[PDB]
């Protein structure tokens, strides 16, 4: 019953980071029957920001990756909050004592600050007080730190599934605070805790952790409980690599969302964090990645978070996945937003067809198809110059727009060919400054296209405004 968690903290911003550790560990269960579990870990009430949490939740159902168990929702596994559990945490750390796992350390912090200086760190001198005495000074309320009781003349081997075994010596390996004077527990005593009476089976984290499993270990077999499977993840970068970093790549989820980039392509491209699928293959999300799934295919690279990248991929997304009714969907709270409009679904569908070559984001959309919502749209410097270097063109062509019916772009290529052949001038000379005149871009899509798209009295009313 693989039985996976995420375990964010609720200290900011939806980080990239959590989206692909996420996955990873969503994957697994669904590709196994198994259980994907959410616990907020909440105690670093220093680090906590308000409507974090709240944010976390949504983007992991944003990319797709629901859960069965998390906090706005509670479940078996009760409290899926750190900082709600407190309790449980110090009747094992007592329990570990009652037992003579760990111990209490009252060294001010003053003092453990010269011991260091000294020693390289702690000496785990206060193993040598008496069991009771060192109750007696609880009791009176002196102020301690419940350390790890690490069996100092023996060994310690821990598996990692993608790493292999390590062997390693119980002096490499420190009487770390289990609890702190205040009572909270240290990463240490938490995890083991939550993660035994959660039920996780798998531990797929940050790389970050695979240092500290011969303590998590250790502390399995204190209480004597059994060790989960332990995968340490590759970690992410930048390009000229460097683990990732907010100044330094995007590393906000949210910020994703804004830019119009589509769930399902971030989604995609964590993928390809570290795991190639055996077809080569760089697209299908989800369903077919769950099953592709394998330990066999992890790289343990440090992968590579190129956002031009990402940017190629949301394209593809947008021209040979999603269907021109799906993007023409996704586009309009950007047009919205950007305080634009169509006069008929039609055309809305004509317009996103027709720019769909130029625009990897639905961000892009309402400002590079701007002119085909609003009588008012920037016009490039290049743009006017070239409006004014055909002026006294499109002065002579008007009268012959203002006659014509039909608005096809047929019929309007066949009179702008006639109108160039009638001048002594090859098209481009009425080309560009049309375009210039029509689009105020200089460079666009079928001129044609462009032309016939916004209808008749658009296309006038514009080239009197340019002229007039």
Same mark, same amino acid.
């Given at each position: ?23 990873? &560990? ?67 750390? +007592? ?60 060994? $310690? ?12 010596? &119980? ?35 940050? +790389? ?37 970093? !907010?100044?330094?790549?995007? $590393?906000?989820?949210?910020?994703? !969302? ?33 099953? /592709? ?16 990248? =990402? ?77 004014? +270097? ?19 772009? /047929?019929?309007?290529?066949? =009179? ?9 001038? !090859? ?11 029509? $689009? ?19 296309? =006038?009313?514009? =080239? +009197?405004?340019?002229?007039?």
């Amino acid at each position: 019953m693989v039985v996976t968690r995420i375990a964010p903290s609720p200290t900011g911003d939806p980080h990239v980071g959590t989206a692909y550790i996420a996955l990873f &560990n969503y994957a697994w269960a669904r590709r196994n029957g198994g259980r994907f579990i959410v616990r907020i870990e909440d105690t670093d009430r220093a680090r906590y920001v308000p409507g974090a949490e709240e944010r976390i939740l949504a983007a992991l159902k944003w990319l797709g990756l629901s859960y069965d168990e998390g906090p706005d929702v509670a479940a078996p596994t009760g409290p899926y909050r750190q900082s709600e559990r407190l309790p449980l945490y110090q009747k094992y750390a +007592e329990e570990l004592l009652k037992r003579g796992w760990a111990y209490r350390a009252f060294e001010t912090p003053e003092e453990l600050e010269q011991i260091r200086k000294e020693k390289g760190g702690y000496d785990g001198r206060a193993r040598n007080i008496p069991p009771e005495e060192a109750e007696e000074r609880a009791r009176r309320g002196e102020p301690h730190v419940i350390r790890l009781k690490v069996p100092r003349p023996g060994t $310690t081997e821990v598996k990692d599934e993608l790493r292999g075994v390590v062997v390693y010596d &119980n002096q490499e390996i420190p009487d770390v605070v289990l609890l702190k004077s205040d009572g909270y527990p240290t990463y240490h005593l938490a995890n083991v805790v939550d993660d035994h009476l959660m039920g996780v089976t798998d531990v797929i984290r940050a +790389e970050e952790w695979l240092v500290s499993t011969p303590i998590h270990v250790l502390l399995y077999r204190a209480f004597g409980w059994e060790a989960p499977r332990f995968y340490h993840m590759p970690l992410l970068r930048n390009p000229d690599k460097t683990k990732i970093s !907010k100044r330094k790549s995007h $590393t906000s989820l949210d910020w994703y !969302k804004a830019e119009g980039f589509l769930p399902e392509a971030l989604r995609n491209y964590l993928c390809l964090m570290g795991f190639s699928m055996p077809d080569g293959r760089e697209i299908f999300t989800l369903e077919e990645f769950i099953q /592709a799934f394998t330990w066999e295919r992890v790289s343990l690279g440090g992968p590579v978070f190129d956002l031009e990248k =990402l940017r190629w991929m949301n394209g593809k997304y947008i021209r040979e996945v999603l269907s021109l009714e799906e993007v023409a969907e996704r586009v309009k709270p950007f047009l919205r937003e950007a305080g634009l409009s169509w006069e008929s679904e039609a055309y809305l569908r004509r317009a996103v067809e027709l720019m769909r070559p130029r625009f990897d984001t639905l961000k892009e959309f309402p400002e590079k198809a701007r002119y085909l919502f609003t009588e008012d749209y920037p016009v490039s410097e290049k743009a006017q110059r070239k409006l004014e +270097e055909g002026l006294p063109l499109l002065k002579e062509l008007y009268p012959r727009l203002r006659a014509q019916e039909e608005w096809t772009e /047929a019929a309007l290529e066949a =009179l702008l060919r006639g109108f160039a052949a009638e001048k002594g001038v !090859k098209l481009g000379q009425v080309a560009q400054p049309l375009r210039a005149a029509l $689009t105020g871009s200089l460079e666009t899509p079928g001129l044609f296209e462009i032309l016939a798209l916004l209808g008749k009295e658009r296309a =006038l009313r514009r =080239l +009197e405004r340019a002229l007039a």
